Structures are given as C-alpha cells and as structure tokens.
Short mmCIF file of C-alpha atoms and ligand atoms in Angstrom, two decimals:
data_model
loop_
_atom_site.label_atom_id
_atom_site.label_comp_id
_atom_site.label_asym_id
_atom_site.label_seq_id
_atom_site.Cartn_x
_atom_site.Cartn_y
_atom_site.Cartn_z
CA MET A 1 -182.68 -50.21 -128.77
CA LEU A 2 -184.15 -49.53 -125.11
CA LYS A 3 -181.85 -48.02 -122.39
CA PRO A 4 -178.42 -49.47 -123.45
CA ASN A 5 -175.39 -49.03 -121.38
CA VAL A 6 -173.36 -46.34 -123.02
CA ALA A 7 -169.49 -45.78 -122.51
CA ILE A 8 -167.60 -42.58 -123.02
CA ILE A 9 -164.10 -42.98 -124.59
CA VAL A 10 -161.76 -39.94 -124.41
CA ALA A 11 -158.06 -39.09 -124.23
CA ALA A 12 -157.02 -36.31 -121.72
CA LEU A 13 -153.87 -34.77 -120.41
CA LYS A 14 -153.31 -34.90 -116.61
CA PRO A 15 -153.84 -33.06 -114.30
CA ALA A 16 -156.31 -30.59 -115.81
CA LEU A 17 -157.80 -33.07 -118.16
CA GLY A 18 -157.48 -30.90 -121.27
CA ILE A 19 -158.75 -32.46 -124.50
CA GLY A 20 -158.43 -29.86 -127.30
CA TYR A 21 -157.09 -26.66 -128.68
CA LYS A 22 -158.83 -24.47 -131.22
CA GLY A 23 -161.09 -27.30 -132.58
CA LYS A 24 -158.27 -29.87 -132.86
CA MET A 25 -156.47 -32.46 -130.62
CA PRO A 26 -153.34 -30.98 -128.94
CA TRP A 27 -151.16 -34.08 -129.79
CA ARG A 28 -150.73 -36.80 -132.32
CA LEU A 29 -150.44 -40.17 -130.69
CA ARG A 30 -150.27 -42.94 -133.26
CA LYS A 31 -150.80 -45.89 -131.04
CA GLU A 32 -153.66 -44.14 -129.27
CA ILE A 33 -155.72 -43.54 -132.51
CA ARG A 34 -155.23 -47.28 -133.30
CA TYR A 35 -156.42 -48.31 -129.83
CA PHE A 36 -159.56 -46.08 -130.31
CA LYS A 37 -160.17 -47.89 -133.73
CA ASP A 38 -159.95 -51.25 -132.32
CA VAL A 39 -162.06 -50.63 -129.14
CA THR A 40 -164.77 -48.90 -131.06
CA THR A 41 -164.97 -51.57 -133.89
CA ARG A 42 -164.62 -54.94 -132.23
CA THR A 43 -167.79 -56.78 -131.43
CA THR A 44 -168.38 -60.29 -130.03
CA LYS A 45 -171.94 -61.05 -131.34
CA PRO A 46 -172.30 -62.04 -135.02
CA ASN A 47 -174.04 -59.74 -137.39
CA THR A 48 -173.53 -56.64 -135.16
CA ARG A 49 -171.63 -53.41 -135.10
CA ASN A 50 -170.96 -50.81 -132.48
CA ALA A 51 -172.40 -47.13 -132.61
CA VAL A 52 -170.35 -44.03 -132.06
CA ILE A 53 -172.06 -40.89 -131.04
CA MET A 54 -170.44 -37.41 -131.70
CA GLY A 55 -171.40 -33.83 -131.59
CA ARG A 56 -171.63 -31.88 -134.93
CA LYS A 57 -168.39 -30.00 -134.41
CA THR A 58 -166.48 -33.26 -134.09
CA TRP A 59 -168.01 -34.83 -137.11
CA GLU A 60 -167.08 -31.63 -139.13
CA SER A 61 -163.58 -31.84 -138.05
CA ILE A 62 -163.03 -35.22 -139.71
CA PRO A 63 -162.07 -34.70 -143.43
CA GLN A 64 -165.10 -35.37 -145.60
CA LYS A 65 -163.31 -38.25 -147.36
CA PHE A 66 -162.74 -40.14 -144.07
CA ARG A 67 -166.35 -39.91 -142.64
CA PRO A 68 -168.36 -41.81 -141.76
CA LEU A 69 -165.92 -43.78 -139.62
CA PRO A 70 -165.85 -47.15 -141.16
CA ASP A 71 -167.42 -50.33 -139.66
CA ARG A 72 -169.44 -48.49 -137.03
CA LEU A 73 -172.93 -46.78 -137.10
CA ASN A 74 -172.16 -43.06 -136.84
CA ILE A 75 -174.57 -41.01 -134.96
CA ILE A 76 -174.26 -37.07 -135.21
CA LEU A 77 -176.14 -34.86 -132.68
CA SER A 78 -177.25 -31.43 -133.37
CA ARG A 79 -179.97 -29.41 -131.63
CA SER A 80 -181.11 -28.45 -135.21
CA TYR A 81 -181.46 -31.94 -136.37
CA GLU A 82 -184.76 -33.99 -136.98
CA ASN A 83 -184.33 -37.80 -136.16
CA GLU A 84 -183.43 -39.09 -139.50
CA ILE A 85 -181.66 -42.21 -140.91
CA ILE A 86 -179.26 -40.75 -143.67
CA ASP A 87 -178.00 -44.15 -144.89
CA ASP A 88 -177.18 -47.41 -143.20
CA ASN A 89 -174.03 -45.76 -141.64
CA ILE A 90 -175.21 -42.25 -140.57
CA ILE A 91 -178.07 -41.11 -138.26
CA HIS A 92 -178.91 -37.47 -137.47
CA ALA A 93 -180.55 -36.79 -134.06
CA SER A 94 -181.00 -34.12 -131.50
CA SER A 95 -180.88 -36.22 -128.46
CA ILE A 96 -178.89 -39.47 -127.48
CA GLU A 97 -181.98 -41.31 -126.41
CA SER A 98 -184.05 -40.47 -129.49
CA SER A 99 -181.24 -41.60 -131.62
CA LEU A 100 -181.04 -45.09 -129.82
CA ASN A 101 -184.76 -45.61 -130.85
CA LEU A 102 -183.65 -45.60 -134.47
CA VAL A 103 -180.95 -48.42 -134.15
CA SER A 104 -180.89 -52.16 -134.00
CA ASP A 105 -178.29 -54.86 -134.25
CA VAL A 106 -175.90 -52.74 -132.25
CA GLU A 107 -173.59 -54.38 -129.66
CA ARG A 108 -172.08 -51.40 -127.77
CA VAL A 109 -172.59 -47.63 -127.87
CA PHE A 110 -169.70 -45.27 -127.39
CA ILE A 111 -169.73 -41.40 -126.99
CA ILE A 112 -166.68 -40.20 -128.83
CA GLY A 113 -166.62 -36.34 -128.22
CA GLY A 114 -166.43 -33.55 -128.31
CA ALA A 115 -166.12 -31.37 -125.08
CA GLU A 116 -169.69 -30.08 -125.02
CA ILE A 117 -171.12 -33.64 -125.55
CA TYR A 118 -168.82 -34.97 -123.07
CA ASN A 119 -169.69 -32.45 -120.23
CA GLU A 120 -173.36 -32.73 -120.72
CA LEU A 121 -173.64 -36.46 -121.15
CA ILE A 122 -171.33 -37.50 -118.28
CA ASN A 123 -174.46 -36.71 -116.06
CA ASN A 124 -176.93 -38.93 -118.02
CA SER A 125 -177.58 -42.18 -116.17
CA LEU A 126 -177.32 -44.20 -119.41
CA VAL A 127 -173.50 -43.59 -119.16
CA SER A 128 -172.15 -46.57 -117.18
CA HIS A 129 -168.33 -46.68 -118.29
CA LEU A 130 -165.66 -44.19 -118.89
CA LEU A 131 -162.65 -45.24 -120.96
CA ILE A 132 -160.00 -42.68 -120.34
CA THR A 133 -156.66 -42.53 -121.80
CA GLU A 134 -154.62 -40.66 -119.09
CA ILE A 135 -151.78 -38.78 -120.75
CA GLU A 136 -148.70 -37.46 -118.88
CA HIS A 137 -146.12 -34.89 -120.04
CA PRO A 138 -143.26 -33.49 -118.00
CA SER A 139 -144.37 -29.89 -118.63
CA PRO A 140 -148.24 -29.90 -119.25
CA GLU A 141 -148.31 -26.20 -118.83
CA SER A 142 -146.44 -25.82 -122.05
CA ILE A 143 -149.24 -27.61 -124.12
CA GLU A 144 -151.77 -25.08 -125.17
CA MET A 145 -155.30 -26.32 -124.37
CA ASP A 146 -158.62 -24.38 -124.40
CA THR A 147 -161.02 -27.33 -123.88
CA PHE A 148 -161.32 -29.51 -120.71
CA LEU A 149 -163.19 -32.26 -119.12
CA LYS A 150 -165.55 -31.34 -116.23
CA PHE A 151 -166.19 -34.65 -114.85
CA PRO A 152 -167.29 -35.53 -111.31
CA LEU A 153 -164.66 -38.19 -110.56
CA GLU A 154 -165.33 -38.37 -107.00
CA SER A 155 -168.58 -40.38 -108.00
CA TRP A 156 -166.53 -42.93 -110.21
CA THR A 157 -164.16 -45.66 -109.28
CA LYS A 158 -161.04 -46.50 -111.38
CA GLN A 159 -160.99 -50.18 -111.97
CA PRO A 160 -157.93 -52.44 -111.99
CA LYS A 161 -156.40 -53.26 -115.34
CA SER A 162 -157.89 -56.65 -115.21
CA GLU A 163 -161.41 -55.21 -115.59
CA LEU A 164 -160.29 -53.11 -118.58
CA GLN A 165 -158.75 -56.15 -120.13
CA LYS A 166 -162.11 -57.92 -119.79
CA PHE A 167 -163.98 -54.98 -121.30
CA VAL A 168 -161.76 -54.84 -124.38
CA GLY A 169 -161.39 -58.57 -124.93
CA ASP A 170 -158.57 -59.31 -127.50
CA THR A 171 -157.05 -55.84 -127.68
CA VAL A 172 -153.40 -55.59 -126.59
CA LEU A 173 -152.99 -53.20 -123.87
CA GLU A 174 -149.43 -51.91 -123.38
CA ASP A 175 -148.39 -50.04 -120.28
CA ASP A 176 -146.69 -46.61 -120.04
CA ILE A 177 -146.74 -46.12 -123.70
CA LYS A 178 -144.38 -43.33 -124.75
CA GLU A 179 -144.65 -41.12 -127.82
CA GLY A 180 -142.25 -38.30 -128.03
CA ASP A 181 -142.60 -36.66 -124.59
CA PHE A 182 -146.05 -38.10 -123.80
CA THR A 183 -146.54 -41.11 -121.60
CA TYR A 184 -149.94 -42.75 -121.57
CA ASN A 185 -152.09 -45.55 -120.11
CA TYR A 186 -155.55 -46.78 -120.81
CA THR A 187 -158.06 -46.94 -117.87
CA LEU A 188 -161.74 -48.07 -117.06
CA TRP A 189 -164.00 -46.27 -114.63
CA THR A 190 -167.39 -47.24 -113.27
CA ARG A 191 -169.94 -45.45 -111.09
CA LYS A 192 -169.85 -45.88 -107.33
N1 NDP B 1 -159.19 -35.68 -126.59
C1 NDP B 1 -160.25 -36.40 -127.12
O1 NDP B 1 -160.51 -37.67 -126.82
C2 NDP B 1 -161.32 -35.75 -128.14
C3 NDP B 1 -161.26 -34.36 -128.16
N2 NDP B 1 -162.06 -33.73 -129.04
C4 NDP B 1 -161.96 -32.25 -129.12
O2 NDP B 1 -163.27 -31.66 -128.69
C5 NDP B 1 -163.17 -30.27 -129.24
C6 NDP B 1 -164.46 -30.11 -129.97
O3 NDP B 1 -165.52 -30.01 -128.91
P1 NDP B 1 -166.77 -29.01 -129.06
O4 NDP B 1 -166.45 -27.73 -129.71
O5 NDP B 1 -167.37 -28.82 -127.72
O6 NDP B 1 -167.84 -29.86 -130.02
P2 NDP B 1 -168.71 -31.07 -130.19
O7 NDP B 1 -168.03 -32.11 -130.91
O8 NDP B 1 -169.11 -31.40 -128.69
O9 NDP B 1 -170.00 -30.40 -130.76
C7 NDP B 1 -170.85 -29.47 -130.22
C8 NDP B 1 -172.20 -29.46 -130.92
O10 NDP B 1 -172.78 -30.71 -130.72
C9 NDP B 1 -174.21 -30.36 -130.66
N3 NDP B 1 -174.58 -30.71 -129.27
C10 NDP B 1 -173.96 -30.56 -128.13
N4 NDP B 1 -174.49 -31.01 -127.14
C11 NDP B 1 -175.72 -31.35 -127.55
C12 NDP B 1 -176.80 -31.94 -126.93
N5 NDP B 1 -176.76 -32.23 -125.56
N6 NDP B 1 -177.71 -32.41 -127.63
C13 NDP B 1 -177.84 -32.16 -129.02
N7 NDP B 1 -176.94 -31.63 -129.73
C14 NDP B 1 -175.76 -31.29 -128.87
C15 NDP B 1 -174.49 -28.97 -130.95
O11 NDP B 1 -174.89 -28.94 -132.38
P3 NDP B 1 -175.57 -27.56 -132.89
O12 NDP B 1 -174.71 -26.38 -132.70
O13 NDP B 1 -175.52 -27.97 -134.42
O14 NDP B 1 -176.68 -27.45 -132.21
C16 NDP B 1 -173.17 -28.34 -130.65
O15 NDP B 1 -172.74 -27.20 -131.12
C17 NDP B 1 -162.03 -30.19 -130.16
O16 NDP B 1 -160.99 -29.55 -129.68
C18 NDP B 1 -161.74 -31.79 -130.44
O17 NDP B 1 -160.46 -31.94 -130.94
C19 NDP B 1 -163.11 -34.41 -129.77
C20 NDP B 1 -163.05 -35.70 -129.63
C21 NDP B 1 -162.22 -36.57 -128.81
C1 GW3 B 2 -160.96 -40.65 -135.51
C2 GW3 B 2 -161.33 -39.16 -135.55
C3 GW3 B 2 -160.67 -38.38 -134.39
C4 GW3 B 2 -161.06 -36.78 -134.77
C5 GW3 B 2 -160.70 -35.84 -133.59
N1 GW3 B 2 -161.14 -38.85 -133.03
C6 GW3 B 2 -162.35 -38.62 -132.72
C7 GW3 B 2 -162.55 -39.17 -131.42
C8 GW3 B 2 -161.31 -39.66 -131.07
C9 GW3 B 2 -160.87 -40.27 -129.88
C10 GW3 B 2 -161.62 -40.61 -128.64
N2 GW3 B 2 -162.88 -40.17 -128.53
N3 GW3 B 2 -161.15 -41.15 -127.69
C11 GW3 B 2 -159.88 -41.72 -127.62
N4 GW3 B 2 -159.35 -42.36 -126.55
N5 GW3 B 2 -158.98 -41.35 -128.60
C12 GW3 B 2 -159.58 -40.68 -129.89
C13 GW3 B 2 -158.70 -40.43 -130.97
C14 GW3 B 2 -159.16 -39.76 -132.07
C15 GW3 B 2 -160.50 -39.37 -132.10
#
C-alpha cells in the first residue's frame, strides 16, 4: 500500500494529556474500549479489513490469549525486527512505512499506541487524522500518570462532531459519557 492516510487513535486525560501509568492504562472505561473496537474494526469496502499498528511494549501488554486483536491486521514495530509476515493477521516491521509495503486489501490504518510510538509518529506526514477521546475528571492531579502525549496541537484543528460522525459512519456517538468520576467525549482533529 503506497502512502495511505494514517489516523492516530488515543484516549487521554485533560489537561496534561496523560495516557498511562507503569505500563498500563490509568482507568477502565467500558464504553470507551467498545468504541475503540468498533472504530478500528468497521470497514465500508467489501473484502477489506483495517490495520492497527502498535509498538512492541503495547503488544506485550495484551494477554497472549487475546492477541492478535481479532478482525484487524496487527502490525508490531520494533527497531530489532526484520520486515516479516508472521501469518495472515500479524506483521513484524521496524518502520511504519516499510510495514505498509507488505499489506494489501486494507481500508484504514490506525496507530494504536503506545507513548513512544505516538510521540514520534505525530510528526510523520502520513498521519492525517487524530481521534482523541478527551477524558475529564474533577481532580486529575489525584490520578497517577507517568506517560503523556507531546502533541503540537497548535498545528491541528478540532473538527465539529458532524465530521467525526462522518468518519465513523454507523457508530453511535454519545456525548458526555460518564463512568465513575470520568466524563469523556470523542473528537476528530485534522492538520491546518
Ligand atoms: N491511553 C491510550 O489510549 C493508550 C495508552 N497506552 C499506554 O502506553 C504505555 C506504553 O507506551 P511505551 O512504553 O512508550 O511503549 P510502546 O507501545 O510505544 O512501545 C515502545 C517500543 O516500540 C518500538 N518502537 C518505538 N518507536 C519506534 C519507531 N519509531 N520505530 C520502530 N520501533 C519503534 C520499540 O521496540 P524495541 O524496544 O523492540 O526497539 C520501543 O521499545 C502504557 O502505559 C500503555 O498503557 C497504550 C495504548 C493506548
Ligand atoms: C485493546 C487493547 C488495549 C491495551 C492497552 N488498547 C490498546 C490500545 C487502546 C486504545 C486506543 N489506542 N485508543 C483508544 N481511544 N482507546 C483504547 C482502549 C484500549 C486500547
């Protein structure tokens, strides 16, 4: 696949944009994990699937029994990997672009984490869209976080919900979702 548009999908706690703590997510938001699954799996074209790209640490964090993530082509990046097709669902690569050369019959490509991947790939021009779940809490300072996004948001524009709706198609987008003390909303950003 030559020069696909790539989207970053992430959930972050405002205002610092914290995303993890000691290798894990700092929260358990049930509806948010379901949205992630629906967005990353759904396709419009016929015999296609989406691709999800992740760093090695993120892959290793999913229990072995639950990987690869079903119904999507999984791509795992490591600086130590040769570009190799493991099976029909798993690819090893050392660069985003080399990995895409190995794929076909993919509709959309999503970068799914983690921190290092996000922070480096945000500056790659292949990245055209950001799907950020913006989480709010009454006392964000009480949530222990060690990992944060370093995104240059002054160069991106947050779109109206109508554009997000168009991006996700059929997916139901509820507003101000509350789970425990967290309140969240889904958003779409594009480059200025
Ligand atoms: N809030 C959210 O939506 C999400 C949060 N996370 C959180 O992220 C954290 C994990 O992030 P982190 O520890 O940074 O790990 P990553 O998942 O980003 O993996 C880092 C590894 O990826 C490889 N890698 C990184 N950058 C590159 C590159 N540019 N080219 C090739 N290989 C690369 C390296 O593998 P090697 O060392 O083998 O070279 C590196 O060690 C956890 O807290 C996790 O819960 C994860 C996903 C979503
Ligand atoms: C499904 C496996 C887990 C492991 C951390 N996971 C990995 C990536 C994501 C993930 C992501 N990238 N974006 C958003 N919005 N939500 C997520 C929820 C869970 C995630």
